[PDB]
Amino acid sequence: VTDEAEASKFVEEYDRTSQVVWNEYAGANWNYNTNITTETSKILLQKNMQIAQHTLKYGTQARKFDVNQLQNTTIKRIIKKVQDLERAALPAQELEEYNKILLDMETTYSVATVCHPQGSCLQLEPDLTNVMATSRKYEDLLWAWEGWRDKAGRAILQFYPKYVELINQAARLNGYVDAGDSWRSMYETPSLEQDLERLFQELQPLYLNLHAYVRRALHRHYGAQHINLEGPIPAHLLGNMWAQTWSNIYDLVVPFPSAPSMDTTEAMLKQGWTPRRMFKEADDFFTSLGLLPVPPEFWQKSMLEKPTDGREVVCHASAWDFYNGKDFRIKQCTTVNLEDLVVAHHEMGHIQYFMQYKDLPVALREGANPGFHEAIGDVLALSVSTPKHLHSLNLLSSEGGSDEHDINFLMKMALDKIAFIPFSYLVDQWRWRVFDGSITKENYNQEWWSLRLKYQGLCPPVPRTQGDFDPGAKFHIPSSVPYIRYFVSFIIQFQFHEALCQAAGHTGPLHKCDIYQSKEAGQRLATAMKLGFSRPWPEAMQLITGQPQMSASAMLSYFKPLLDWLRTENELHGEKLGWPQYNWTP
Ligand SMILES: *[C@@H]1O[C@H](CO[C@@H]2O[C@@H](C)[C@@H](O)[C@@H](O)[C@@H]2O)[C@@H](O[C@@H]2O[C@H](CO)[C@@H](O)[C@H](O)[C@H]2NC(C)=O)[C@H](O)[C@H]1NC(C)=O
Ligand SMILES: O=C(CCC(O)(O)[C@H](Cc1ccccc1)NC(=O)c1ccccc1)N[C@@H](Cc1ccccc1)C(=O)O
Ligand SMILES: CC(=O)N[C@@H]1[C@@H](O)[C@H](O)[C@@H](CO)O[C@H]1O
Ligand SMILES: *[C@@H]1O[C@H](CO)[C@@H](O)[C@H](O)[C@H]1NC(C)=O
Ligand SMILES: [Cl-]
Ligand SMILES: [Cl-]
Ligand SMILES: [Zn+2]
């Protein structure tokens, strides 16, 4: 009775105070992210001590409650969560050192540049990413690929071993075995590893076929002397810095070159699209579903484009919740092209989620699981990418209809959606093994590439050496942001697309579905999002789809036509799926 009452009272206080403290912290973190300076860094590190103080205080009190003797389900869940102090469990000295290391890694990544002797210095966004996406010259791609790793990657190495030591220490102090074990607990699912492995295995026929097909095309453009038709693909040729998405080399793999084009950049530019207009369109798609519009304040405080006042900023896109239920922002160095419009939708998906669960106790303001949070935005972007919708935006002449234009579309989608499966799976497999200690610092890079070869069928264009730390050249590594969430997202977003389309009355091939304006679709998601982190995620999964598991079925259904086409096309050329000569390197 009174224990239950003491618990209930504790949660209420934790909420009121956390809102204030958390809001304050977000403010300083935002000031640092949109203006990297010595002052803002100082203020951020100091705010780290403030929020840590609050976290230590309430966490300690939370641990005195005996959760598993508390009646109410919502309060028992909140208190269990508060008992996890995360970084605040570290002794004062280790905390300050850990906080600095995280700040230093993030800054190093976000300010790194690759320069030409006595010429121009390029930044990742938008310079280097543009080169990786548009250059079709082996040497130019190589320069940007190797340079980005020399400058950003190598620069993170000095910090990573201490970072692993400290984040692991914190996890242990919180009852976990290592940091990887702590990250996985976010999905409250004992069978997570096996469940993910199975999903990955299911998308292997599709990936191997896409892989073999793309390899053949790269062999055509880059020469037989540079592409082994039975080996891994040079990692700097896929149109993206980390070869995580391949749509930027669509021009080199177009199944039916005769079909009506679907380039939209020149159209977006000519028709005066701007970052602003790009986010407005995402907002309109959301409201078209009967979902929430971003607040007037969003447009006033967000950083929707890279500043031109000489401010140094963290360009990697991110959505921000300031924990007051009114202030939400996006910080994106937006460029005008379809690929970034898709990123804009992704970010807006996070914002929608913030607005949907804003009225829940701050402890429960999270996605059912990190995967869900990443998926929302992507679901709508699937509809936006269809020829039909792009045409309705005037970015396309026609939407086609021909089976050829149809295979071309699935191919462009697969270049991003399917190629991402093994990359997204790989990242944390590497980290979990780094966190559990099976991969020591002397083996960081070698193990990374063993995974790059094993899962993606990729090989580095130039031998790696002692001092290289390629993982460091990928944002989430130095920023300490879990990655398995994106793997889950990519699987489940198709399950959601499939459910929202059925709810919208769509009939026929799933890839032809566009939920724009469907209030039914909007309601399916809203009900699930409002739950925040209050219930086990399988409940949110069922509300949306009707079943409670993760499943690759939706994604396979979406790509079935392409799989069949790829099979026949690859067998016609007698392609050997996989990379037997796995040891080959350009
Ligand atoms: C278990 O408690 C939850 C939460 O109760 C609220 O938070 C407490 C700390 C205290 O401030 C209570 O007075 C609050 O009501 C109950 O769920 C809430 O129920 C109210 C009214 O039905 C609703 O408006 C809230 O949105 C609910 N919040 C959540 C997170 O669901 C719940 O009813 C209690 N369960 C039982 C069996 O009593
Ligand atoms: O990194 C992102 C988008 C950034 C983000 O929106 O996921 C962002 C990352 C981040 C940044 C700083 C601190 C923590 C995480 N996450 C969020 O904005 C976010 C995440 C959870 C809750 C609320 C906001 N996407 C991945 C995968 C991806 C997804 C979709 C298209 C392309 C690529 C990538 O680019 O490699
Ligand atoms: C608009 C508003 O007051 N929303 C509050 C929210 O901030 C708080 O976290 C929650 C407590 O669970 O109660 C809601 O009513
Ligand atoms: C950037 O931060 C510094 C440090 O506080 C401050 O002097 C400057 O005014 C800020 N610039 C902007 C764009 O607000
Ligand atoms: Cl790499
Ligand atoms: Cl995650
Ligand atoms: Zn995200």
From Swiss-Prot:
Ubiquitously expressed, with highest levels in lung, kidney, heart, gastrointestinal system and prostate. The record marks 524-525 as: Cleavage. Chloride 3 binds at residues 187, 485. Changing residue 374 to V: Abolished dipeptidyl carboxypeptidase activity. Chloride 2 binds at residues 149, 448, 452. Residues 1-580 form the Peptidase M2 domain. Phosphorylated on tyrosine residues on its extracellular part, promoting cleavage by secretase enzymes and formation of the soluble form (Angiotensin-converting enzyme, soluble form). Its main location: membrane. Changing residue 524 to Q: Does not prevent cleavage and secretion of the soluble form, suggesting that processing can take place at different sites. Glycans are attached at residues 35, 53, 72, 118, 300, 549. Disulfide bonds join 115-121, 315-333, 501-513. The active site is at 347 (proton acceptor 2), 476 (proton donor 2). Induction: Up-regulated in failing heart. One of its GO terms (biological process) is negative regulation of gap junction assembly. Monomer and homodimer; homodimerizes following binding to an inhibitor. Interacts with calmodulin (CALM1, CALM2 or CALM3); interaction takes place in the cytoplasmic region and regulates phosphorylation and proteolytic cleavage. This is Angiotensin-converting enzyme. It comes from Homo sapiens. The gene is ACE. The chain holds residues 643 to 1228 of 1306 of the full protein.
